[PDB]
Amino acid sequence: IVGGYTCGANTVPYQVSLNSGYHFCGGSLINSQWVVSAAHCYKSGIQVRLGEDNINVVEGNEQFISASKSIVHPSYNSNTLNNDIMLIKLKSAASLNSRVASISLPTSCASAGTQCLISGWGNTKSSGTSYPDVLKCLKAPILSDSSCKSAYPGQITSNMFCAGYLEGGKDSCQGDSGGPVVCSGKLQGIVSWGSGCAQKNKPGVYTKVCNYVSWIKQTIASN
Numbered sequence: 001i002v003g004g005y006t007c008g009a010n011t012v013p014y015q016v017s018l019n020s021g022y023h024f025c026g027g028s029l030i031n032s033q034w035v036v037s038a039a040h041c042y043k044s045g046i047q048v049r050l051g052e053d054n055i056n057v058v059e060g061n062e063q064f065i066s067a068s069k070s071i072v073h074p075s076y077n078s079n080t081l082n083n084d085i086m087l088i089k090l091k092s093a094a095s096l097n098s099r100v101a102s103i104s105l106p107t108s109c110a111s112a113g114t115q116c117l118i119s120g121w122g123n124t125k126s127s128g129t130s131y132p133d134v135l136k137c138l139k140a141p142i143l144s145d146s147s148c149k150s151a152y153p154g155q156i157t158s159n160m161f162c163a164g165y166l167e168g169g170k171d172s173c174q175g176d177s178g179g180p181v182v183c184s185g186k187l188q189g190i191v192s193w194g195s196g197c198a199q200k201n202k203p204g205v206y207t208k209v210c211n212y213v214s215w216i217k218q219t220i221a222s223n
């Protein structure tokens with residue numbers, strides 16, 4: 001997260017770290033056995049780490065559970081990143097409490113101007129790599145479709161939305177991919193891509209979760 005702030009330990013109880021011997025992507029807990037992340041964060045050998053704050057220290061509250069299966073969206077396109085969503089089922093269910101809790105799926109899509117919270121352990125510099133030990137947070141508004149398409153002409157599908165600041169300085173970045181964009185207590189986006197990090201006129205692009213609620217529900221129900 002570039003231009004963000006320290007969230008505070010466990011203030012984002014649905015945030016998870018996908019780990020394969022190091023932190024590589026973020027994700028969101030939606031029920032005690034399922035997490036949602038981005039399809040391009042897929043790999044085998046994934047351990048889901050819940051209740052984390054400092055990812056390099058066991059401070060307490062952590063639950064490390066292996067993934068039993070990852071379900072990448074059948075229409076995911078690695079070249080355009082269209083349908084960049086993946087569901088991970090956990091080997092055992094997580095114990096939910098106040099430090100580990102799930103976030104709700106939306107019933108409607110959010111509108112431009114809606115303010116949302118993006119969190120993650122991704123890079124904090126737009127030029128160079130500086131990864132943090134604790135969770136970083138950023139409040140960012142959803143932008144209008146016209147400003148998003150003007151910024152990335154030909155690359156935005158109806159399953160993506162832009163959120164951020166056109167002046168630059170605040171944005172999600174590498175290491176944040178797969179994590180949550182929460183607005184009014186509902187999971188509305190998944191960190192997906194962007195051009196560099198916090199560059200002027202190049203806001204972040206997120207997977208539009210409201211277009212996948214029936215797919216998420218039907219898939220969890222049959223697995």
Ligand SMILES: CC(C)COc1cccc(-c2nc3cc(C(N)=[NH2+])ccc3[nH]2)c1[O-]
Pocket residue numbers: 024025040041042171172173174175176177191192193194195196197198203204205
């Ligand atoms: C499969 C992963 C281990 C590799 O993931 C990645 C490798 C290189 C860059 C990214 C990445 N750049 C990103 C930029 C942004 C942004 N809003 N500017 C957001 C997420 C990003 N994720 C990324 O997610």
Ligand SMILES: [Ca+2]
Pocket residue numbers: 052053054055056057058059060062
């Ligand atoms: Ca820790």
Ligand SMILES: [Cl-]
Pocket residue numbers: 149153154155
């Ligand atoms: Cl266009």
